[PDB]
Subunit: 308 residues, 4 copies
């Protein structure tokens, strides 16, 4: 008997989703596959609403006994957010594997097929359980907490220079190397099963001559949180400093992230806002949205950034 | 005798400009050194008005026969913009070497002293001429066109994964490996000699649920250009698409860059705005500002992006 | 009530051991320090005989109640071997942190002082326990299983492209991100407490026109094992294939590694010898050398390569 | 009219040479293609005598007015050697492009088809001239001087951490970014046109407890050169120092390279043998072999290592 894998489609160039089984007949030797269409939009259009629907459905399917693992086909453009959202909102140790493609299915040497094969193989493997949400492309198995799209148009784009990959897929075999040393899945305190709408969170970029009016626009629309993609280690300019303090005076929680692409944004009492640890602007937004459904205490939200 | 080098201080933790020559006595074997204080601010607060002052001063010094090269002490936070600005505005083949430090001068194993030594050595080397503006940190010699701060807090933060370094400094010797295959310095058409104020350009970030009102804020303040740090290869959401087309109808030139960190944003007739080629959002802003001093024509500006 | 850390010196430019301790007075805030001279040689002359003495000395100290961790100053040249050797021979959860320096103590911006600070900082932190042998340089905390010198002369040389670092040291604070998913230290079956002399193992490189007579030389001198630093994924030429099979007929255990620098060498029934998994030629030698002290069974040794 | 490209086949899993031309019909839009079978072997079996045949054939083809460029299908295992050999022996500015595949043609998502398309596109582009020998895989255009297989089994294996790529291929467009700053092809003094057999050169690895008898083996078999894949920056042990000096006394030229994978091996008057600059053990052997057809003078050979 083979494992039971459920493929949730959200759109992307990886694909209908029912044509894939006929195009990749090697999946038959992996597991019993059942497809399901959740959404049909590009990742660039992936919204906070669809992530709620996706997460609730994942927790419902993983609760069943006739479901061993879930493979989620998604677009590459916002694969920095999606997997990490599920990494904090899934209440099961069963494998949730995100898969995508950098080349269209009709392109020469399309990466779709092999990426899909690797994703299902990971979800059907019992050793891959309890490792947090996973992302599989280019024979790599990345952690949702660290993996991000580092290049605009290459196949090997998904990397995590400072953290590497959890494991790899070579010669039709899986090789696990490291484990995520952060709070994830079953040990997470974030439960959005009842949540209907998530708090609004903007992302403002840090740069030379950065305008203060961007922060004013976020305040006008009464957003609950702001992630600052700052220069270097979350460093603020005189205009950015004024904009952040103006937001904090309105009760808005501001988290200082970095535009660099990796590294630690350290705590600093001389600067306003909380720090994003090693979380990117995109992922810092996700954690902030979920943290705002739980509390408004700066010290508690700061704890989440150093632990999740 | 030895070459004549002028150290231009603008701020940063690497520094007063008079103390710099005292802490590193090994500089005396490299060149005859003079210092000037162009500015005294943190890189996070570096502005366009100061870059105009710096570029004009550099060109005045390099035109003199008694100046062989210049070294510019600058902060790391916006070292992505400054060197590239001068890479477009400098009118001489004489080496312009930006140098910075990731650790305070008082810290244990401060990187400043060796970085400055490496920078002065590069500026005093005759073989360093006609290579564009250089950036020297951690024994590496990078191009202003490709080098960016890839990590928020590490010593080896300045990288260019797709382009590498122009050269390295090992065992008190310079090793050049590659040359910049783009337009720069003496062949550049950008001139700010008679410029008092440059056209304003903002950078808007791309992410899930990205607000269209950020573009409205840029429009209301009459910016001449907008750089979009897009999802993946500069992909726009439904809200981002509407915000861009609204900006274009007001005469605002928009260029689609990427939040990924590297790679090519390819042309696409299905999306609005121009494409940033391999230019990062920070460097795209700098090039756009200078491009807007010569023309507003989309085709001519697009050509600049594929050539500079 | 500060932790008790003992510093064991073996050699390298980072180093007597007494002169270093007082050169970094910031160590006093970390823990109580005591130094011991195990050896005084460049790492290029480090031998398996000295590793036996070092591993036993470490085990004596880690058995004591008045010792919380050990810091080992070593050279960078063979820092690929040493730490991994103790990762299999140390029988304690207490932190064993290897440290080195790429620049001499007298050089401008020497890295030693900070590297030593980080090493002691890590060895004194109770959260460092049970993570295997650690290697600390350039604000990084790498696993002895993955970390290696990737560059001949740079400060940031120690990297692990496919696995990243276990953690980083930023702003006088430790940030752990990953855990080694391999058998190490306390769970290790390798015990050299009563071993006086380790089996001899040679490393033979793979390349175009590689001679078979190198394998004949290993056989003639009676080595117990041979590590093949093969082309690509351990691919053997006509001459390498013949040499390996000739060694196997004499009882020599051969393991196929890779000259590439990273990646998996997959099992192949068409080629002779065992496979090194993701272990480098240097680390494969250390493991094979320890595996030969227990068994000569090809099946048992092959499994050591997939678990350790 | 379309350019005239000749595809030379030597072997590899990417491939009958006429079988591939039919497998990728998109090649017809690039250029007029002809195929020749130079050899049919796995790159692990590539030898210097075949390189002589290949180089001599490439030179006579490029000398023809009806040939605009050459694409060479090859295996990945020794793609570190071959391209660099031709980088020193080709007497034409016309593009010589090596291409390979990490996955067999029959595998799912085989990279072969796209790599070949990229290779032909590069060879057919007139702007590819005067850039030295090129290597095209995974949408990247690497220099024969820097590019190497950095991973045993991944598609993106071919990288050059410190130098990057000469250009990239995105959206059916070539983007040249850097140019090789070394002597190559047309300006190279190495000519093997009238060479029937090349000097024998061995590569000896550096590690803890490295045997001196490996050097004795090379001496006994009368090699003309020895490349030392040394520890760190070409560091020798007591045994390695004695072996190298012993070889030098027999008139054998020894070059100290590095097992690290990248970086500069600096000159050192305290150690024996010449230094490899930034050349890897694989590429160092190729240069030494070619240099030995012209001279045995250590100074001249050392100069080749810093220039080529
Ligand atoms: N804009 C598309 C790109 C195609 C893809 O990478 O999946 C998306 O993100 O869905
Ligand atoms: N915010 C400071 C950091 C110190 C430095 O990088 O020099 C600056 O960029 O100037
Ligand atoms: N050969 C010396 C290099 C200096 C160092 O890196 O410590 C050693 O490895 O000990
Ligand atoms: N041993 C084969 C591997 C397959 C390939 O890379 O083409 C070769 O190098 O030719």
């Amino acid at each position: 008997n083979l494992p039971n894998i459920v493929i949730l489609a959200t759109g992307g160039t990886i694909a209908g989703v029912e044509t894939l089984i006929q195009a990749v007949p090697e999946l038959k030797t992996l597991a019993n596959i059942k497809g399901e269409q959740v959404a049909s939009i590009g990742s660039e259009n992936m919204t906070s609403d669809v992530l709620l629907t996706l997460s609730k459905r994942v927790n419902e399917l993983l609760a069943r006994s006739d479901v061993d693992g879930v493979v989620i086909t998604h677009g590459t453009d916002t694969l920095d957010e999606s997997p990490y959202f599920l990494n904090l909102t899934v209440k099961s140790d069963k494998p949730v594997v995100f898969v995508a493609a950098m080349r269209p299915a009709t392109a020469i040497s399309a990466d779709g097929p092999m990426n899909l094969y690797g994703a299902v193989k990971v979800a059907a493997d019992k050793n891959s359980r309890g490792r947090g949400v996973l992302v599989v492309l280019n024979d790599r198995i990345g952690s949702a907490r660290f993996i991000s799209k580092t290049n605009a148009s290459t196949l090997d784009t998904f990397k995590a220079p400072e953290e590497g990959y959890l494991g790899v897929i070579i010669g039709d075999k899986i090789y696990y190397q490291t484990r995520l040393d952060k709070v994830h899945t079953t040990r997470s305190v974030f439960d959005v099963t009842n949540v209907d709408k998530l708090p609004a969170v903007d992302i403002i970029y840090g740069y030379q001559d950065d305008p203060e009016y961007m922060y004013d626009a976020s305040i006008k629309h009464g957003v609950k949180g702001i992630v600052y993609a700052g220069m270097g280690a979350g460093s603020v300019s005189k205009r950015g400093d004024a904009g952040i303090r103006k937001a904090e005076s309105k009760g808005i929680v501001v988290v200082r992230s970095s535009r660099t692409g990796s590294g630690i944004v350290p705590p600093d009492a001389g600067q306003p806002g909380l720090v994003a640890d090693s979380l990117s602007p995109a992922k810092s937004r996700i954690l902030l949205m979920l943290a705002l459904t739980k509390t408004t205490n700066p010290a508690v939200i700061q704890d989440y950034f150093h632990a999740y």
